[PDB]
Design a protein around this nucleic acid. Structure first.
Lengths: 123, 50, 100, 50, 50
DNA sequence: CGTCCGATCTTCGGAAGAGATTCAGAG
DNA sequence: CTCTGAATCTCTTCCGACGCGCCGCGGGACG
RNA sequence: UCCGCGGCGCG
């Protein structure tokens, strides 16, 4: 009851077309295995370019990077097994397969500002 | 002679050895190694003798 | 004929994955580490300077960040195919051949 | 004494077994979202892989 | 070769070039918009693999 | 009507060549 | 003792006739 | 029509 560090973000490689499905699958595993405290949220980037005409109309869903997703966790081998056991997804990315490396928070809040800048005043 | 060349003398380390050998570059864990060993030779989902 | 502009450097596979290790023998270091460096899982030193690291010092991820903590001033380690290209740029044929 | 023959029955059995393991993986994945009697056992079942 | 139908006789070369050019311009889009360091690492790795 | 691409098949020689080991020797 | 070092063991790889004819196949899941 | 793979057969 002494380890309370900056709760970490890692990256998970997801196949194309399942990104929301991967997010809701991790949410389902969190709510099923009942370690909702050990696990956190998932920050997948979304932006909305809107065009009235030209094929797709009134909306166009694009994102910064489709191949990867950012997920909130702590360091735990049980969490590692839980993430790996999720279907329709590959797993972590890092220096070594056993323990992925974290991500510097400077570009984290930079991309937070980026999504805040792009995403504002809906419709 | 086989036991002389044996690199391990305990169940945990032998499980670690086989777990690392069959799938290289994975985190060696007691539970994972034991589950994989049991699922290779004693679980009807994968192993099955007619 | 046309061309595609690769945004990032990449290594030619034939000069890597052949029984004679042309890149390995030219760099005089076994092919095991070049594969790891090329496929983005370990670090290689490129003229780290008057530090405790060698010219061909192979490094892991954890040791790299630890060394960067203490030697972020002038010690430089680059990783990847771009790093391999940069390291190949920083060598001379004549001195190596006469030394050998 | 150690060579046997198998026929269309065994081939059908093996292919059907593979189809069933795939479809039951799918059914388990969809039943993980199981909920109170708002579903009627046809949408979870997908005949396309079979 | 134009095949009679909605698809043409395509070798693997054009598909491989399509995959590689898609990888390259997606990497260019990532790096130009200042993608995070971890993302471009695996991106370059998978481009090299391709 | 377009867009974009995760689980384990499983048992040859026959060399050729490269990589890893070893143990042995003058001492 | 010890480093060397010639020899030994082990791991990876490219290989397997040449013509012809016939037929069958040639995605597929999803926003 | 033209491409590739598999199977079979002939020499």
């Amino acid at each position: 009851m002494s380890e309370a560090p900056k709760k970490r973000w890692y990256v998970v490689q997801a196949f194309s077309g399942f990104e929301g499905r991967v997010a809701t699958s991790l949410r389902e595993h969190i709510k099923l295995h009942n370690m909702e405290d050990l696990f956190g949220e998932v920050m997948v980037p979304t932006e909305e370019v809107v065009e009235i005409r030209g094929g797709q109309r009134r909306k166009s869903e694009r994102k910064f990077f489709p191949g990867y997703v950012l997920v909130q966790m702590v360091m735990n081998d049980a969490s590692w097994h839980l993430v790996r056991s999720v279907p329709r997804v590959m797993g972590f990315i890092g220096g070594t397969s056993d323990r992925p490396a974290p991500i510097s928070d400077k570009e984290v809040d930079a991309i937070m500002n980026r999504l805040q800048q792009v995403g504002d005043k809906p419709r | 002679e086989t036991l002389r060349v044996d690199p391990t003398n305990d169940r945990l380390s032998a499980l670690v050895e086989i777990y690392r050998m069959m799938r290289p570059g994975e985190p060696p864990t007691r539970e994972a190694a034991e589950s994989l060993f049991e699922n290779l030779f004693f679980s009807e989902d994968r192993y099955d003798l007619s | 004929m046309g061309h595609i502009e690769l945004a990032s450097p990449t290594a030619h596979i034939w000069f890597l994955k052949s029984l004679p290790s042309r890149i390995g023998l030219l760099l005089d270091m076994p092919l095991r580490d070049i594969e790891r460096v090329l496929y983005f899982e370990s670090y290689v030193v490129i003229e780290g300077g008057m530090t405790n690291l060698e010219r061909q010092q192979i490094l892991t991820e954890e040791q790299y960040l630890d060394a960067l903590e203490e030697f972020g001033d002038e010690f430089d380690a680059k990783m990847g195919a771009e790093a391999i290209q940069a390291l190949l740029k920083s060598m001379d044929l004549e001195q190596e051949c006469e030394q050998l | 004494g150690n060579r046997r023959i198998r026929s269309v029955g065994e081939m059908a059995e093996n292919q059907f077994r593979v189809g069933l393991v795939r479809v039951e993986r799918a059914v388990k994945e969809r039943l993980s979202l199981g909920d109170l009697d708002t579903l009627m056992p046809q949408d979870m079942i997908n005949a396309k892989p079979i | 070769v134009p095949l009679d139908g909605g698809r043409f006789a395509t070798s693997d070369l054009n598909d491989l070039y399509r995959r590689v050019i898609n990888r390259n311009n997606r990497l260019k889009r990532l790096l130009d918009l200042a993608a995070p360091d971890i993302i471009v690492r695996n991106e370059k790795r998978m481009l090299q693999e391709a």
